[PDB]
Paper text:
Helicase E5 is a multi-domain protein; its primer synthesis and DNA unwinding activity are required for genome uncoating and DNA replication of MPXV. MPXV E5 is encoded by the E5R gene, the mature protein is 785 amino acids (aa) in length. MPXV E5 can be divided into 6 domains: the [name] domain, the ZnD domain (Zinc-binding domain), the D5N domain (a domain associated with D5-type helicases), the Linker, the SF3 Helicase domain, and the C-Tail. MPXV E5 belongs to the SF3 helicase superfamily, which normally forms hexamer and unwinds DNA with 3′- to 5′ polarity.
In addition to the [name] domain of MPXV E5, we also performed crystallization study for the [name] domain of [name] D5 and solved one structure at 1.4-Å resolution. Similar to E5 [name], one PPi was captured in the D5 [name] structure. As revealed by structural superposition, the overall folding of E5 and D5 [name] domains are virtually identical; the RMSD value between the two domains is only 0.2 Å. These observations indicated that the folding and catalytic activity of the [name] domains are highly conserved in MPXV E5, [name] D5, and the helicases from other orthopoxvirus viruses. Identical structures indicated that the overall folding and catalytic activity of the [name] domains are conserved in MPXV E5, [name] D5, and, most likely, in all other poxviruses members.
Numbering used by the authors: 2 to 224
The structure:
Amino acid sequence: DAAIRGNDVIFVLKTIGVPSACRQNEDPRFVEAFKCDELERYIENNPECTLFESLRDEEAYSIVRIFMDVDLDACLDEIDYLTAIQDFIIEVSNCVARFAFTECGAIHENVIKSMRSNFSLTKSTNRDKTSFHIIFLDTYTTMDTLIAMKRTLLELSRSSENPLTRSIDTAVYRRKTTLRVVGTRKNPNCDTIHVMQPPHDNIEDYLFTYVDMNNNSYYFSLQ
Ligand SMILES: [Mg+2]
Ligand SMILES: [Mg+2]
């Protein structure tokens, strides 16, 4: 669609708690904008880095991929994890598609198809928990739409018997929100990272602000 442009510049914060003025003035001690190949190189050259992806100017442009931060503070047997991931995709796509259909004028079947057909999953290396980020690579909305969906997702987490669905962290749907970049640390005191998982090997597949639509992409927003 002519009214939808993409984004290939990834804005990252370099620590937790970056002051708003430093985001706005782009103080390089705190923030930097990268193309994906430059971001990969920065990570390789700064192995202590703690990077957090965020929208550079959400008032001007706020198209994002649907993403979830799943924070289960428990171990799962491998078979239970695999079954739960499959069920999670069904439950979450059904819930987003219903919301998109009723609140966004969306084509329900296109939300279902786009979300189920292409998503990336990280895995936290902390084996005492079941923590991951999921990005629906081909399902796009605006951040304000995700904020409007926050309570619907909260209610889904409270009604589900799936331990992963119950662990969706809905606090991430907010202005100036961040998602820690795959492969990087949270703080200088914790060495655990999220790793990529097959079949997605490219960093752009793990970024919620990277927008490169094609005919498989589906976009919806509040209407
Ligand atoms: Mg998390
Ligand atoms: Mg969280």
